[PDB]
Design a binder for this molecule. Structure first.
Ligand code: MG
Ligand code: MG
Ligand code: MG
Ligand code: MG
Ligand code: MG
Ligand code: MG
Ligand code: MG
Ligand code: ZN
Lengths: 135, 69, 114
RNA sequence: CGAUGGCCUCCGUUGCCCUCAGCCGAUCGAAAGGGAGUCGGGUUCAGAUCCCCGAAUCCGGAGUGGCGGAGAUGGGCGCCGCGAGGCGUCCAGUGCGGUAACGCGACCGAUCCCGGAGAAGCCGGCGGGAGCCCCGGGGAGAGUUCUCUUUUCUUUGUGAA
RNA sequence: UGAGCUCUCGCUGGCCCUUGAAAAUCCGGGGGAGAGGGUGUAAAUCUCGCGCCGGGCCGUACCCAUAUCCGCAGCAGGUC
RNA sequence: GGAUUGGCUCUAAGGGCUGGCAGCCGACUUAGAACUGGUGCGGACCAGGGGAAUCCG
RNA sequence: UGGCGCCAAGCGCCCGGCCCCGGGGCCGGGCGCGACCCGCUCCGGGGACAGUGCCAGGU
């Protein structure tokens, strides 16, 4: 049946954020009034962490392993789904469709997404999600 | 040439060190204030009259003023 | 009717001696020499015949004085490749990577059976 | 690595070592090919996109960069304060918006690599925009008026950026 | 007001056993080597706005044609 | 190889804009008719003589 | 399948400087596998003929 769930990893296909990897946080397969097309709110990473390695100090490690995230609602036609998924928890109250009516709490949503992405990336799990797509 | 449309930035450019002189053109239905800077000539156009001659004393004292007769 | 003459010393109708009529405040018709028409950059795809959007179409040496945003569009490969070809490239890269992964896993399975 | 000057700060000047790497071949060859960027008015006996007046514009340069604006100024916790607002710890901050085409005043980045513009024949048809011509009037000045002719003729504007 | 004339911009088609320049110069992108600061007087850095200084050398008059050119000439010729 | 062609006065057909219709604008054409001139009308200018055959290319 | 690919990852062995308590921490370097070893023509293709120099005959 339907495969594009609220835990999927999606390759974003258009817009300023093109070629980035995001995670769907809330899908809507039936268009709402303001958006007749089916869509989904996702959280992605804009600046991937740099290729860290050994033989460098952990101050440099921390400086390089820093993520810049974005939160956006996308049309389904501009999203390419994958077979991967990440179980990273995102707070629904902070990250929701109401975040776009002001620029104050959108910064909070991006902050929370960035913090969660960093603490998950530091563990080394889902490492594919944190490497840029070479295209 | 550059047109200034709001009142105060005209005085802001008038008080710049670069500004050389301001000339006042008084035609019918318009009053034009032309301030000559290094790069552009800034024109401010006033439709009514009373704003014009209550601004005429608002220019900096050290800036040359020339009434076009 | 006032017949008018050239203003430069080039008396031939070459590609650089192109003019247009204009009315001076002195109530006269004079020649103004026109710049050549620029072209918007062509896509790096090599297939799409149109020219890129969002980029000013001026001569190459005029690009030196334009601002950065006037010469490109804020997207990956923006200002040099069209959006359709960018999407196709993205899909192709991801799909070939997946194909390679599945081929490698099938090879590993075959080796395990061997 | 070695030396100098400048408040020897930080940088400049070199001299040596390490490291980095192709050239399509020195050079010449177009006053019609390519080639950034100046227009209007006035002026002489003879010169004007060149002189004067007035509006611009391109390229190059600047220890201290001259200055604004952007990078930028947020969140959490313990607090004070009724609050406003103000303290002490942590954490982020190489911009932001639009589903998208893309937009916003800027929005770090080297060697290297890819691409674009420069950079393209002849002919046909059609459409848009100017200049000119044309028609009906308002003015201003001239011509005919033996008869007629609300008549005939001239003129009736705005540069670059 | 006009299938009016000229110029220019654009769309579209036809023809080729013809396919109809190069370089100087300039720009965008991919990458991500480096640099900045520890919360501030913020720093590195800005293709944004304004401001400061300079642009050297050579040609420039006139004829351009039944009289300023070439034909021995103020030549019914020739000359883009 | 034939006919016509001037001048003048008409008629008919060929369209746009606004609110099967109504109103308001309009650009050149084409055809037909009457009248008329000392049969003259592409009145100046511009502007193919024709046909039947042979030789050669 | 009209994508990307360089300027090492990793591993091993040494060294320096700073700090803290011989050990640890912090910063910054060197070498070697990764990328096997040895060799006498850069690889191929011809070759004592092509070819060249000088004589002789024909045309
Ligand atoms: Mg030329
Ligand atoms: Mg040369
Ligand atoms: Mg030349
Ligand atoms: Mg004009
Ligand atoms: Mg001359
Ligand atoms: Mg015969
Ligand atoms: Mg013949
Ligand atoms: Zn394309």
């Amino acid at each position: 049946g339907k495969f594009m769930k609220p835990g999927k990893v999606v390759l974003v296909l258009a817009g300023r954020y093109s070629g980035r990897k995001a995670v769907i946080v809330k899908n809507i397969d039936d268009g709402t009034s303001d958006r007749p097309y089916s869509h989904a709110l996702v959280a992605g990473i804009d600046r991937y962490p740099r290729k860290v390695t050994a033989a460098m100090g952990k101050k440099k490690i921390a400086k390089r392993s820093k993520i810049k995230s974005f939160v956006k609602v996308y049309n389904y036609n501009h999203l390419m789904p994958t077979r991967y998924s990440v179980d990273i928890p995102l707070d629904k109250t902070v990250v929701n469709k109401d975040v776009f009516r002001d620029p104050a709490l959108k910064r909070k949503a991006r902050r929370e997404a960035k913090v969660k992405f960093e603490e998950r990336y530091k563990t080394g799990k889902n490492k594919w999600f944190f490497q840029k797509l070479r295209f | 040439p550059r047109k200034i449309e709001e009142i105060k930035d005209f005085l802001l450019t008038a008080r710049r060190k670069d500004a050389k002189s301001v000339k006042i053109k008084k035609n019918k239905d318009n009053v034009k204030f032309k301030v000559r800077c290094s790069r552009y000539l800034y024109t401010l156009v006033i439709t009514d009259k009373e704003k014009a001659e209550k601004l005429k004393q608002s220019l900096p004292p050290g800036l040359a003023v020339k009434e076009l007769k | 009717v006032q017949r008018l003459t050239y203003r430069r010393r080039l008396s031939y109708n070459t590609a650089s001696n192109k003019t247009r009529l204009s009315r001076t405040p002195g109530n006269r018709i004079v020649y103004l020499y026109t710049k050549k028409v620029g072209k918007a950059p062509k896509s790096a795809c090599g297939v799409c015949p149109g020219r890129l959007r969002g980029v000013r179409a001026v001569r190459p040496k005029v690009l030196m004085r334009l601002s950065k945003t006037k010469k490109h569009v804020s997207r990956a490969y923006g200002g040099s490749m069209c959006a359709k070809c960018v999407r196709d490239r993205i899909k192709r890269a991801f799909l070939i990577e997946e194909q390679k992964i599945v081929v490698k896993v099938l090879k590993a399975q075959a080796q395990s059976q061997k």
